[PDB]
Amino acid sequence: NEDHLAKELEDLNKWGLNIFNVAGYSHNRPLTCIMYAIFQERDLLKTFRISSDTFITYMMTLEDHYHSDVAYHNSLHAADVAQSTHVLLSTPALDAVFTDLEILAAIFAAAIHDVDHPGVSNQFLINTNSELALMYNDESVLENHHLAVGFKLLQEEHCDIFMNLTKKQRQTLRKMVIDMVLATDMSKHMSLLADLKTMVETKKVTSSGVLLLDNYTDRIQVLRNMVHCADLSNPTKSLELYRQWTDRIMEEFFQQGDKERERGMEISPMCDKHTASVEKSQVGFIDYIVHPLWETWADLVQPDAQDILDTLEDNRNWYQSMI
Numbered sequence: 474n475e476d477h478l479a480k481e482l483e484d485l486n487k488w489g490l491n492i493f494n495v496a497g498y499s500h501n502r503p504l505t506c507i508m509y510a511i512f513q514e515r516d517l518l519k520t521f522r523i524s525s526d527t528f529i530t531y532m533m534t535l536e537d538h539y540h541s542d543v544a545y546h547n548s549l550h551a552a553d554v555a556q557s558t559h560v561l562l563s564t565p566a567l568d569a570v571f572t573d574l575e576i577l578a579a580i581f582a583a584a585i586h587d588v589d590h591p592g593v594s595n596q597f598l599i600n601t602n603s604e605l606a607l608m609y610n611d612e613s614v615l616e617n618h619h620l621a622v623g624f625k626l627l628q629e630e631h632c633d634i635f636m637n638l639t640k641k642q643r644q645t646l647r648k649m650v651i652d653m654v655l656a657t658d659m660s661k662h663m664s665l666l667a668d669l670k671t672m673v674e675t676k677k678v679t680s681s682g683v684l685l686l687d688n689y690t691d692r693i694q695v696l697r698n699m700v701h702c703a704d705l706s707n708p709t710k711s712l713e714l715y716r717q718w719t720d721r722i723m724e725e726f727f728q729q730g731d732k733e734r735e736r737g738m739e740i741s742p743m744c745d746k747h748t749a750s751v752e753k754s755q756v757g758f759i760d761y762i763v764h765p766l767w768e769t770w771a772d773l774v775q776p777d778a779q780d781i782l783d784t785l786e787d788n789r790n791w792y793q794s795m796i
């Protein structure tokens with residue numbers, strides 16, 4: 474078991490680590506497991522002077538604030554998105570571009586980015602006049618909530634993993650984490666992608682092939698898109714993995730739709746189990762959102778995302794063939 478887990482973790486730095494297996498061999502604590510592994514691997518506990526006690530206490534509490542009864546937005550998704558962010562941060566075209574603080578912020582953002590998710594969409598919370606929707610004026614409702622919960626937990630006993638950052642580092646990491654978690658709001662996707670496209674149209678590259686990211690706005694725009702890419706990375710994974718993720722998301726979609734029906738609401742796109750095509754939905758989603766995003770990302774970091782994009786396109790065609 475320890476041996477099995479260690480074996481899965483050989484793939485820690487690789488796209489398509491099998492996080493499902495990690496969850497199995499870590500007694501269903503994939504977020505705590507993978508975060509500890511990532512922080513050990515990048516030396517973040519040492520660099521930011523975080524004790525293992527404090528770190529594991531925060532991560533255990535964080536993971537406990539993901540809902541195990543929600544089919545997709547649970548701690549396995551968080552873990553997967555944290556591990557994918559960790560891989561993307563090490564893309565060659567981005568070597569030496571980001572600071573230790575930016576790396577910390579990205580992985581932390583990815584870890585907390587869906588904490589306390591109820592398993593329904595922002596539109597559902599809005600259309601049902603949720604307390605959260607009211608709190609945040611219908612604006613990035615769940616994403617504002619994830620941030621509020623992920624940060625509040627840092628104030629629990631033995632949980633402040635940022636205690637030994639400098640004041641300015643703490644302030645800057647909070648802003649960057651906010652930015653990256655808000656970037657997982659699908660409402661911001663088109664503007665994120667437009668900015669990424671600009672990034673690409675005007676990219677500055679060294680002789681070695683590494684991207685030149687002068688100002689802070691350039692860096693955070695890449696980091697936002699990076700976390701958004703990691704959040705939408707399921708279709709770019711090996712088909713056996715992606716299919717597992719699809720099963721989960723449709724289960725979650727069908728539950729929301731059942732809630733909408735029982736409340737006499739109009740059922741949301743892809744949430745009516747009696748009429749939904751899982752395959753058609755995935756293809757549409759890849760065509761309209763995921764592929765344009767990842768193709769632009771691939772352009773930014775060319776050729777580093779060649780296999781990812783090839784996998785995306787192959788999975789797209791496979792699902793389309795299953796319609």
Ligand SMILES: N#Cc1ccc(Oc2ccc3c(c2)COB3O)cc1C#N
Nearest residue numbers: 546587657659704705722743754755758
């Ligand atoms: N079709 C479609 C489709 C449409 C929107 C969408 O938006 C998102 C994207 C990421 C996250 C969330 C919603 C909630 O928390 B995040 O994991 C996902 C799918 C899909 N699949």
Ligand SMILES: [Mg+2]
Nearest residue numbers: 586587615657
């Ligand atoms: Mg989300």
Ligand SMILES: [Zn+2]
Nearest residue numbers: 586587657704
């Ligand atoms: Zn997510």
